Amino acid sequence: MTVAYIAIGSNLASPLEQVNAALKALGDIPESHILTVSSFYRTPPLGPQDQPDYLNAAVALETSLAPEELLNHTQRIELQQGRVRKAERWGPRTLDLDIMLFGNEVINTERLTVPHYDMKNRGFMLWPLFEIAPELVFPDGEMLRQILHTRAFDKLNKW
Numbered sequence: 001m002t003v004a005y006i007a008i009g010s011n012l013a014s015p016l017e018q019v020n021a022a023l024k025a026l027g028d029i030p031e032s033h034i035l036t037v038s039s040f041y042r043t044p045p046l047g048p049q050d051q052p053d054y055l056n057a058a059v060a061l062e063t064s065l066a067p068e069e070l071l072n073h074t075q076r077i078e079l080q081q082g083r084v085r086k087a088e089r090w091g092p093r094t095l096d097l098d099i100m101l102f103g104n105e106v107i108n109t110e111r112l113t114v115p116h117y118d119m120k121n122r123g124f125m126l127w128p129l130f131e132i133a134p135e136l137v138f139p140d141g142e143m144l145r146q147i148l149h150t151r152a153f154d155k156l157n158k159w
């Protein structure tokens with residue numbers, strides 16, 4: 001069994017409802033169990049800013065699925081909650097499920113890059129992760145606590 005960490009974001013169609021629904025759906029993924037859920041945070045948008053604030057959270061999920069099988073299931077949940085690909089890059093969405101980490105595995109396949117390529121630069125990922133896994137060490141040996149102690153990130157406000 002491997003512990004995966006998933007980032008959850010939503011800024012459309014009642015984010016609290018979307019995130020609660022996503023948590024129920026995550027609990028229904030085969031060969032998997034939710035270990036921990038962070039608080040929910042109301043975060044200003046990074047990238048394009050002409051969109052609503054996000055609800056961001058993190059979840060720890062224990063699984064015996066292959067990493068790409070986990071991805072299959074997270075994509076299914078996004079699609080079933082009305083996620084649609086649009087023209088604009090990094091636009092608003094009903095639900096975004098990013099696989100941040102899959103144990104200490106390092107993956108670059110066509111569908112899947114883990115660790116998430118930009119998570120070490122995103123407070124809305126790192127703070128909820130720290131809440132649920134304060135002792136976390138990345139596959140490259142970097143400590144989550146050290147990143148947050150060293151780098152400027154705004155603290156998050158609760159949803």
Ligand SMILES: Nc1ncnc2c1ncn2[C@@H]1O[C@H](COP(=O)(O)CP(=O)(O)OP(=O)(O)O)[C@@H](O)[C@H]1O
Nearest residue numbers: 090096097098099100110111112113114115116118
């Ligand atoms: N760690 C990961 N978690 C989820 N999807 C991933 C991933 N690594 C690669 N992907 C791929 O990313 C593709 C596009 O996903 P999108 O959700 O549109 C990018 P985004 O989340 O809006 O931006 P971001 O990656 O900068 O956070 C998916 O079809 C999936 O195959």
Ligand SMILES: Nc1nc2[nH]c(SCC(=O)c3ccccc3)nc2c(=O)[nH]1
Nearest residue numbers: 008009043044045046047054056090124
């Ligand atoms: N508060 C917030 N902003 C986001 N922005 C995106 S997509 C773009 C993005 O994260 C980025 C970060 C740095 C530079 C350019 C784009 N997802 C989220 C999210 O879940 N939360």
Ligand SMILES: [Ca+2]
Nearest residue numbers: 009096097098
């Ligand atoms: Ca994302």
Ligand SMILES: [Ca+2]
Nearest residue numbers: 096097098099
């Ligand atoms: Ca995504």
Ligand SMILES: [Cl-]
Nearest residue numbers: 014015016017
């Ligand atoms: Cl809401």
Ligand SMILES: [Cl-]
Nearest residue numbers: 083084093094
């Ligand atoms: Cl959407």
Ligand SMILES: [Cl-]
Nearest residue numbers: 121122123124
């Ligand atoms: Cl940030």
Ligand SMILES: [Cl-]
Nearest residue numbers: 115138139140
């Ligand atoms: Cl790493």
